[PDB]
Amino acid sequence: YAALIADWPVVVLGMCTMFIVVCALVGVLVPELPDFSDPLLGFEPRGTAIGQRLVTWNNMVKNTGYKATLANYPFKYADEQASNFHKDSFFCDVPSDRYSRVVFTSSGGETLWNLPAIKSMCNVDNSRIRSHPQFGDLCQRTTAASCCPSWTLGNYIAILNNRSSCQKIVERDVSHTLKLLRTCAKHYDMAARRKDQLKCTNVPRKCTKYNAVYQILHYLVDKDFMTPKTADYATPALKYSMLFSPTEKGESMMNIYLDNFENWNSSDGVTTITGIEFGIKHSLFQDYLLMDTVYPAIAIVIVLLVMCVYTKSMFITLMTMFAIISSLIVSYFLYRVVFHFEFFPFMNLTALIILVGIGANNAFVLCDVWNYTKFDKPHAETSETVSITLQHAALSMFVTSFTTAAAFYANYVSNITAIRCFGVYAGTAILVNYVLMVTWLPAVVVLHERACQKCHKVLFAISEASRIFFEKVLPCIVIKFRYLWLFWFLALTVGGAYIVCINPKMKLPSLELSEFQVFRSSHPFERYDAEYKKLFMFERVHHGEELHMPITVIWGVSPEDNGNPLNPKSKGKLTLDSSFNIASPASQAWILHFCQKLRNQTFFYQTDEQDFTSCFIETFKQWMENQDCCCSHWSFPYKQEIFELCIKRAIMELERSTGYHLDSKTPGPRFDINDTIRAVVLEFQSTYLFTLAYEKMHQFYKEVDSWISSELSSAPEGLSNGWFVSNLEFYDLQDSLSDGTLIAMGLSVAVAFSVMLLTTWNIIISLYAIISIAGTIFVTVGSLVLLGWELNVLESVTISVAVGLSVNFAVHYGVAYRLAPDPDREGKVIFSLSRVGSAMAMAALTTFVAGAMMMPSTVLAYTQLGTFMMLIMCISWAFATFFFQCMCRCLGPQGTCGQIP
Ligand SMILES: CC(C)CCC[C@@H](C)[C@H]1CC[C@H]2[C@@H]3CC=C4C[C@@H](OC(=O)CCC(=O)O)CC[C@]4(C)[C@H]3CC[C@]12C
Ligand SMILES: CC(C)CCC[C@@H](C)[C@H]1CC[C@H]2[C@@H]3CC=C4C[C@@H](OC(=O)CCC(=O)O)CC[C@]4(C)[C@H]3CC[C@]12C
Ligand SMILES: CC(C)CCC[C@@H](C)[C@H]1CC[C@H]2[C@@H]3CC=C4C[C@@H](OC(=O)CCC(=O)O)CC[C@]4(C)[C@H]3CC[C@]12C
Ligand SMILES: CC(C)CCC[C@@H](C)[C@H]1CC[C@H]2[C@@H]3CC=C4C[C@@H](OC(=O)CCC(=O)O)CC[C@]4(C)[C@H]3CC[C@]12C
Ligand SMILES: CC(C)CCC[C@@H](C)[C@H]1CC[C@H]2[C@@H]3CC=C4C[C@@H](OC(=O)CCC(=O)O)CC[C@]4(C)[C@H]3CC[C@]12C
Ligand SMILES: CC(C)CCC[C@@H](C)[C@H]1CC[C@H]2[C@@H]3CC=C4C[C@@H](OC(=O)CCC(=O)O)CC[C@]4(C)[C@H]3CC[C@]12C
Ligand SMILES: CC(C)CCC[C@@H](C)[C@H]1CC[C@H]2[C@@H]3CC=C4C[C@@H](OC(=O)CCC(=O)O)CC[C@]4(C)[C@H]3CC[C@]12C
Ligand SMILES: CC(C)CCC[C@@H](C)[C@H]1CC[C@H]2[C@@H]3CC=C4C[C@@H](OC(=O)CCC(=O)O)CC[C@]4(C)[C@H]3CC[C@]12C
Ligand SMILES: CC(C)CCC[C@@H](C)[C@H]1CC[C@H]2[C@@H]3CC=C4C[C@@H](OC(=O)CCC(=O)O)CC[C@]4(C)[C@H]3CC[C@]12C
Ligand SMILES: CC(C)CCC[C@@H](C)[C@H]1CC[C@H]2[C@@H]3CC=C4C[C@@H](OC(=O)CCC(=O)O)CC[C@]4(C)[C@H]3CC[C@]12C
Ligand SMILES: CC(C)CCC[C@@H](C)[C@H]1CC[C@H]2[C@@H]3CC=C4C[C@@H](OC(=O)CCC(=O)O)CC[C@]4(C)[C@H]3CC[C@]12C
Ligand SMILES: *[C@@H]1O[C@H](CO)[C@@H](O)[C@H](O)[C@H]1NC(C)=O
Ligand SMILES: *[C@@H]1O[C@H](CO)[C@@H](O)[C@H](O)[C@H]1NC(C)=O
Ligand SMILES: *[C@@H]1O[C@H](CO)[C@@H](O)[C@H](O)[C@H]1NC(C)=O
Ligand SMILES: *[C@@H]1O[C@H](CO)[C@@H](O)[C@H](O)[C@H]1NC(C)=O
């Protein structure tokens, strides 16, 4: 093979170039452009035995009945034969959470009860919001000039006074309202009085305006809550104050934020803006993404310089960077076209950075080996030199790349879709980059055969410095101490294990699915949702608003998920039916007995006022004991000939008599299009309060499912029947994250250990390598959990990639343990050090820098990836070198080897 790369470089160069050009061209032309519109799109498990039920339930809700061509699941249609408002008080409506808002703080002295702060609120509202051309104002009064007031606290100060305006303040109404709140705050024990002209019930005081006090304490500023155990001084300090806006929130608002809020720190010296809610956190996202392609580019540039210092040429560095980019391109082509599945979950974006930190990890090695094979046997042909260097470097480069490739492929086990796609893409990228490192680089190396004094002398100075560093002093500083490092790293390993296994481990996520932190942790959009949603009362009351958890039993459809689950488009499913029957009287009696028994439990909650949300057979039987209509005065289980008609007549009569809305969620039995009772749906109220934690939800699900699983029913409606499905999907996400992470970590560790054992043929060295990998994993994850982290759809992949990146700085030191000198421990170490220390140090430094350049970004994935890469590379290099070399006091010259070659 070596004869090919020799004397024929341009051939393979042109061939690879044409292959890459056609690959890029097809991959750009044929498939469609990715969306990036939704930052979170694949974060839903599939085929987890609960995701199937959630999908089937959401499909059942989708196909509601319609008066005109229901076309599926109508309620009764085939047989159906039909033939506040005042404009006074300057305000439109009570405050709600469907209007845009901001929050002011950061005053001098931490107190805003003063004319400056209120006037600044009014001024910034008039300047940054009203001045922009806007048509979203309510304009309750037909006059556009009186569209709506600014809704500040000064407006309430004014309306509590006789003269009302945003500007004209007397400074006496301020003190009046301060005393008013100081004396009537204890009444908040009360609710909205609706003081149009007076209130009905016995009120605490008859000096209440149109819900003035209740609004100012409930919806507006509520930091202190005005009921603490502080001093009797009627002047307490308030921290944060919220200000609404009459216009609605949504994608329409985004324009305003583009113009006035991006660059401006604070409008006034006395007030600032520390939290904003316009409802555009997930729509603006895409834009910032583009704005943060600066930091990657710079990183790439820096990398080049480093290589241009190590490999003295620039040709090699340029061709290596081209090889990496080419690998990304051809990997995308293999991803979208031949593999045939279509989804680009934006996590693949953060793949680029990773590859830049791993593509060079081999280049150096190759070049290095070449130079060595050039020092020995100087007078030689290119073919034999190429064959020698290939035999010396190919196996090591393949092990180094394939371990990480396997670690990235092992994420094809988890159920989430984003993780699956990211794993497949990154694995293919790494393997293709290895193939290019084996084919493209030898060609360019062979082909490369070709104030100067100052640059040359300083470069030689740097070269001799690096040589004397990695050749003399590092072996001494590593092998002389030899006892501080052992105990130090054992202490660090034990501490990491204690932080991962005993003291607070990686807590499962707590924010809801719709409120994932996507931007930086200091952006206004994120600071609001992190703190001020929890510090204000009008949203804290909704937070855990005593919502009980429902049950749901369905017999019609079958829990069958068929939506191309193999990396789906995350779209497209289908419903279906079954072959049971509910017509037999035995089935009716069994349903009655099932309801009677299910009410005899400890998880069922009782309310005494259920009309129809409970079982329908009970309400139907209650509709009996009547006549003059046909069937009356019979036994309970009927011959179903009358029942087929009575079940329509009764449901029609009841839906006519009561029920303003009974569609798409109510437990009424579901008919087919023409004539039958296809599906039935029962629901009950439980007593578990819908916590957001994991343990309680797990307990509830396990208990209710284990109880309802026992059916022992008639032949019809017994199979495909159980179908307990509550609103538990966040618990599904948490469980899927946990299981996927565990299994992927296990597989990655197994592959790493197997490859490390098969590459050296020595168990004594494999054991030390395993100890080092374990220590690195433990310390890295301990540091990550100390900084404050939690399992998400990124850290779950990072934990698995850490194992793959760990063995890198150990396979090389194990391979470099094959040499001529005999001495067991104090020998055969300086050789490996002086030979591979420079390569390992440079290979770690380049990815350290390429990861550290991501810190100033704004998107959160970039920051997290940067800090993780920095941490893992520092810790892995330190452990590998110091530990692995220092713990070589236990190996001899013929400890152990393999049996048969
Ligand atoms: C598509 C891009 C990204 C890669 C293109 C790769 C090749 C088509 C190019 C890249 C650099 C080129 C080389 C740049 C310089 C030279 C030296 C040139 O000879 C001289 O400069 C004369 C003096 C001497 O040889 O001493 C002969 C062509 C050659 C080998 C070129 C051959 C074609 C090469 C390998
Ligand atoms: C240094 C070399 C070897 C690699 C460079 C990698 C990146 C820094 C490059 C590759 C893709 C480039 C992007 C390709 C396309 C676009 C869209 C382009 O969009 C517009 O010009 C929008 C305005 C308009 O179209 O009128 C702006 C530059 C940008 C983000 C480019 C920015 C620079 C990127 C990220
Ligand atoms: C150690 C390494 C070399 C092992 C192989 C790793 C990857 C090359 C493999 C692992 C799992 C594979 C995937 C497993 C299953 C599928 C579904 C498969 O579906 C079909 O073939 C559908 C055919 C049709 O109906 O048209 C397409 C390839 C794909 C994505 C595979 C692509 C190649 C993958 C990523
Ligand atoms: C992997 C990173 C570290 C390097 C840079 C690559 C990406 C960050 C670049 C390459 C392609 C770029 C995209 C190319 C085209 C578009 C479409 C563009 O669409 C619109 O402006 C409107 C679309 C519509 O609504 O129809 C928005 C920016 C976006 C997503 C760009 C965002 C930035 C992207 C993803
Ligand atoms: C799909 C295409 C474009 C690329 C496929 C990759 C092959 C071109 C690579 C993959 C692994 C390579 C092999 C890896 C290692 C060796 C051992 C090497 O052994 C020697 O020359 C021994 C020299 C000595 O005695 O020191 C000979 C080349 C060879 C077979 C390599 C030949 C090129 C191979 C087959
Ligand atoms: C290889 C090393 C780095 C560990 C990698 C995994 C850990 C970083 C994470 C992933 C899954 C996590 C677990 C996911 C779920 C749970 C159950 C959770 O259970 C409860 O809260 C109590 C009720 C119960 O025991 O189920 C306690 C934390 C724990 C063990 C977590 C502990 C930390 C784990 C093992
Ligand atoms: C190279 C290898 C050796 C690295 C380490 C891999 C495993 C040996 C680690 C990774 C995750 C660890 C687990 C993380 C969390 C737990 C839960 C812990 O139990 C609880 O937290 C129970 C809490 C409760 O009572 O609700 C017991 C240890 C265990 C199983 C740990 C056992 C050791 C595990 C499997
Ligand atoms: C022989 C020497 C050169 C070895 C050096 C390697 C370790 C001793 C270093 C490298 C990574 C360092 C860690 C990187 C990050 C952190 C997290 C950091 O966390 C916090 O500061 C938590 C509190 C907070 O900031 O809110 C505490 C220090 C620590 C554990 C560092 C401790 C020292 C570590 C383990
Ligand atoms: C051995 C030689 C060749 C290199 C040694 C490099 C270190 C001495 C320096 C150079 C780059 C430095 C980093 C450059 C940028 C940052 C980001 C910086 O970020 C913040 O302060 C976070 C701000 C926030 O919380 O928003 C923290 C320090 C850090 C990691 C620096 C840590 C110290 C580093 C690694
Ligand atoms: C070995 C030779 C060839 C290269 C050595 C490079 C380092 C000496 C320098 C050059 C570029 C530096 C980086 C340039 C920019 C930044 C971003 C900077 O970001 C912040 O300070 C974060 C601010 C924030 O929190 O918003 C942190 C230091 C860092 C990583 C620097 C760390 C030190 C680096 C890598
Ligand atoms: C000089 C080099 C060769 C050896 C010593 C390196 C340490 C001084 C570096 C390595 C990792 C660094 C840490 C990497 C990341 C962070 C997170 C950073 O906080 C953020 O930017 C936000 C993090 C987040 O949001 O998750 C604060 C600095 C810190 C602890 C860095 C502190 C300095 C550390 C320990
Ligand atoms: C203040 O109150 C008096 C009597 O209650 C009323 O006549 C007067 O109009 C009020 N002030 C203003 C500016 O309306
Ligand atoms: C914000 O920066 C501007 C100049 O860019 C400055 O005039 C203003 O005083 C700053 N804000 C504060 C609160 O000082
Ligand atoms: C359920 O309620 C009480 C005991 O909880 C009992 O009198 C009644 O008979 C029970 N019903 C059934 C069907 O067991
Ligand atoms: C509608 O129901 C009638 C019942 O007799 C049946 O004959 C017919 O095939 C049904 N049509 C469809 C499209 O299911």
Q: If you take atom 31 of ligand 8, which residue's CA is the nearest one?
A: 783
Q: Considering only CA atoms, which residue is closest to atom 19 of ligand 7?
A: 501
Residue with tokens 């879709």: 417
| Alpha carbons 61 and 286: distance in angstroms, whole number | 31
Ligand 4 close to Cβ of residue 367 (< 6 A)? no
> Tokens in use for 263?
């660059």
Specify the residue with its C-alpha closest to ligand 7, atom 26: 695
Beta bridge partners of 519: 859
Q: How far is the CA of 501 from the centre of ligand 7 (A)?
A: 6
Q: Establish if 36 belongs to a structural domain.
A: no
Q: Is residue 170 part of a domain?
A: yes
For 826-878, the DSSP string reads SSSSHHHHHHHHHHHHHHHHHHHHHHHTTTT-SBHHHHHHHHHHHHHHHHHHH
CA distance 556 to 579: 9
Q: What residues make up the domain containing 598?
A: 48-83+550-554+583-727
Among 727, 748, 774, the domain-final residue is 727
* Integer Cα distance of 68 and 219 in angstroms: 44
Take atom 29 of ligand 7 and give the residue whose Cα is closest.
501
Angle between helices 830-852 and 351-375 (to 10 degrees): 150
State the sign of the Cα–Cα–Cα–Cα dihedral 45, 50, 54, 57: positive
What is the DSSP secondary-structure string of 388-432?
Answer: HHHHHHHHHHHHHHHHHHHHHHGGGSSS-HHHHHHHHHHHHHHHH
Find, among 283, 472, 330, the residue nearest to 28 by Cα: 330
CA-to-CA dists, residue 697 to 382, 511, 548, 584, 771, angstroms: 68, 15, 12, 37, 38
- Cα radius of gyration rounded to whole Å, the chain: 35
> Alpha-carbon distance 485 to 487, whole Å?
6
Does the C-beta of 81 come closer than 6 Å to ligand 15? no
**Domain total of the chain:** 3
266 and 308 co-located in one domain: no
DSSP, res 97: T
Give CA separation, 78 vs 378, 583, 660, 672, 769, in Å.
Answer: 94, 19, 21, 9, 73
Where b means 16+ CB within 10 Å and e means fewer, 238-255 reads bbbbbbbbbbebeeebee
Residue 837, in any domain of the structure: yes
Which residues have C-beta atoms less than 6 Å from ligand 7? 501, 749, 774, 777
Quick check: CB of 462 below 6 Å from ligand 9?
A: no
Asked if 335 and 431 count as a contact pair (C-beta separation under 8 A), the reply is no
Last residue of a domain, one of 673, 705, 727: 727
Q: Residue 636: enclosing H or E segment and its boundaries?
A: none
Whether the CB-CB separation of 854 and 863 falls below 8 Å is answered with yes
Q: Is 737 in the pocket of ligand 6 (CB under 6 A)?
A: no
Q: How far is the CA of 527 from the centre of ligand 13 (A)?
A: 21
What percentage of the chain's residues is helix, strand, coil (to nearest 5)?
A: 50, 5, 45
Instruction: Give the integer Cα–Cα distance in Å for 435 and 443.
Output: 13
Give the Cα separation of 673 and 63 in Å (integer). 11
- Ligand 10 midpoint to CA 853 (Å): 6
Following DSSP, what letter does each residue of 44-91 receive, concatenated? S--SSSSHHHHHHHHHHHHS---TTT--S--SSTTT---------TT-
Which amino acid does the sequence have at 56?
T
What DSSP line would sit under 573-611, residue for residue?
-----------SHHHHHHHHHHHHHHTSSSSB---S--S
Three-state secondary-structure class, residue 163: coil
- CA quadruple 743, 745, 746, 751: dihedral sign: positive
Q: Which amino acid is at 333?
A: F
Residue 882 near residue 490 (C-beta atoms within 8 A): no
- Ligand 4: atom nearest CA of 36 is 30
Q: Is the CB of 265 under 6 A from ligand 13?
A: yes
Mutate to test the pocket of ligand 7, among 493, 500, 501 (most ligand atoms within 8 A of CB): 501
Residue 882 host element (H or E):
none
Whether the CB of 662 sits within 6 Å of ligand 9: no
* CA nearest ligand 2 atom 1, residue: 297
- 713 in the same domain as 630: yes
Residue whose CA is at the smallest distance from ligand 3 atom 35: 424
412 beta partners: none
CB atoms within 10 A of CB 67: 9
871 and 736 within one domain? yes
Residue 321, both tokens? 């960077």
- Cα 500 to averaged position of ligand 6 atoms, centre (Å): 9
Burial degree of 33 (CB within 10 A; 0-12, 13-18, 19+)? exposed
- In this structure, are 823 and 873 located in the same domain? yes
Query: What gap in Å lies between CA 483 and CA 432, rounded to an integer?
Result: 43
Q: Which helix (H) or strand (E) holds 475?
A: helix 474-479
Amino acid at 681: V
Side-chain-side CA neighbours of residue 543 (13 Å):
13
678: enclosing H helix or E strand: strand 677-679
For residues 684 and 743, membership in a common domain is answered with: no
Q: Whose CA is nearest to atom 8 of ligand 15?
A: 674
Query: Alpha-carbon distance 408 to 414, whole Å?
Result: 12
Same domain flag for 172 and 232: yes
> Same domain, yes or no, for 498 and 645?
no
Is the beta carbon of 577 within 6 A of some atom in ligand 15? no
SS3 553: strand
CA 523 to CA 532: how far, in whole Å? 13
Tell how far the Cα of 26 is from the centroid of ligand 2, in angstroms: 20
Out of 483, 521, 787, mutate this one to test ligand 8's pocket (max ligand atoms within 8 Å of CB): namely: 787
Q: Which of 160, 166, 353, 139 is nearest to 243 (CA)?
A: 166
Name 143's Cβ contacts closer than 8 Å, sequence gap at least 6.
Answer: none
| Final residue belonging to a domain, choices 281, 313, 334 | 281
d(CA 475, CA 885): 9
The reply to whether 40 falls in a domain is no
- Kindly give the residue spans of alpha helices, DSSP state H, lying in 603-666: 616-622, 643-657
Q: How far is the CA of 515 from the centre of ligand 11 (A)?
A: 27
Write a three-state SS string for 238-268.
Answer: CCCEEEEEEEECCCCCHHHHHHHCCCCCCCC
Q: Are residues 803 and 847 in the same domain?
A: yes
Distance 674 CA to ligand 15 centre (A): 6
71 and 181 share a domain? no
CA 743 to chain centre: 19
The first and second tokens of residue 870, run together, are 């920095």
For ligand 3, whether the C-beta of 316 sits within 6 Å is no
DSSP-assigned states of every residue in 736-772? HHHHHHHHHHHHHHHHHHHHHHHHH--HHHHHHHHHH
Instruction: For ligand 3, atom 1, name the residue with the nearest CA.
Output: 406
Ligand 1 and 322: CB distance under 6 A: yes
Question: Does 500 map to a domain?
Answer: yes
Tokens coding 786: 């100390």
**Residue 566, Cβ neighbours under 10 Å: how many?**
10
Tell me if 352 CB under 6 Å of ligand 2: no
**Closest Cα to residue 305, out of 319, 293, 318, 296?**
318
Residue 399 Cα, ligand 5 centroid: separation in angstroms? 14
Q: Which residue owns the Cα nearest ligand 13 atom 9?
A: 269
Residue 299 lies in a domain: yes
Contacts 24+ apart (CB under 8 A), 703-710: 703/603, 704/551, 704/603, 707/601, 707/603, 708/553, 708/598
163 lines ligand 12 (CB under 6 A): yes
How much distance in Å is there from the Cα of 483 to the middle of ligand 10? 34
For the chain, the first-to-last Cα distance in angstroms comes to 24
Cα angle: 64, vertex 68, 73; to 5 degrees? 30
Does residue 533 sit within a domain? no
- What tokens does 464 get? 């001799």
Q: Is 170 in the pocket of ligand 12 (CB under 6 A)?
A: no
Q: Note whether 123 and 225 are same-domain residues.
A: yes
* DSSP state, residue 298: H
Q: How far apart are CA 662 and CA 655, in angstroms?
A: 8
The resolution of the experimental structure, rounded to one decimal in Å, is 3.6
Euclidean distance between CA atoms 254 and 514, whole angstroms: 19
Angle at alpha carbon of residue 114, lines to 113 and 117, rounded to 5°: 90
Which residue CA neighbors atom 25 of ligand 8 most closely? 787
Instruction: Tell me the C-alpha distance between 55 and 46, whole Å.
Output: 9
Q: Whose CA is nearest to atom 11 of ligand 6?
A: 738
Whether 601 is in a domain gets the answer: yes
642 lines ligand 2 (CB under 6 A): no
Q: Are residues 719 and 835 in the same domain?
A: no
**Cβ 309 under 6 angstroms from ligand 10:** yes
For ligand 15, atom 10, name the residue with the nearest CA: 674
C-alpha span between 161 and 169 (Å, rounded): 9
Q: How far apart are CA 840 and CA 364, in angstroms?
A: 9
d(CA 149, CA 163): 15
**Short-list 675, 36, 708, 25, CA closest to 345:** 36
Distances in whole angstroms, Cα of residue 92 to Cα of each of 95, 96, 587: 9, 12, 56
> Can you spell out the DSSP letters for 167-218?
S---SHHHHHHHHHHHHHGGG--------SS--SS--S-S---SSHHHHHHH
Give the Cα-Cα-Cα angle 547, 720, 617 (nearest 5 degrees).
60
Same domain flag for 703 and 778: no
Distance (Å, rounded) from C-alpha 800 to C-alpha 777? 10
566 CB under 6 A from ligand 3?
yes
State the distance from the centre of ligand 2 to the C-alpha of 130, rounded, in angstroms.
36
How far is ligand 3, taken at its centre, from the CA of residue 824, in Å? 47
Q: How far, in whole angstroms, is CA 245 from its chain's centroid?
A: 31
Contact 829, 866 (CB under 8 A): no
| Cα(385)–Cα(370) distance, integer angstroms | 8
| Nearest-CA residue for atom 20 of ligand 1 | 450
For residue 519, which phi and psi values (nearest 5 degrees)?
-90, -175
Sign of the dihedral defined by the CA atoms of residues 835, 837, 838, 844, in that order = positive
- DSSP state letters, 440-454: HHHHHHHH----HHH
What φ, ψ does residue 245 adopt, rounded to 5°?
A: -155, 140
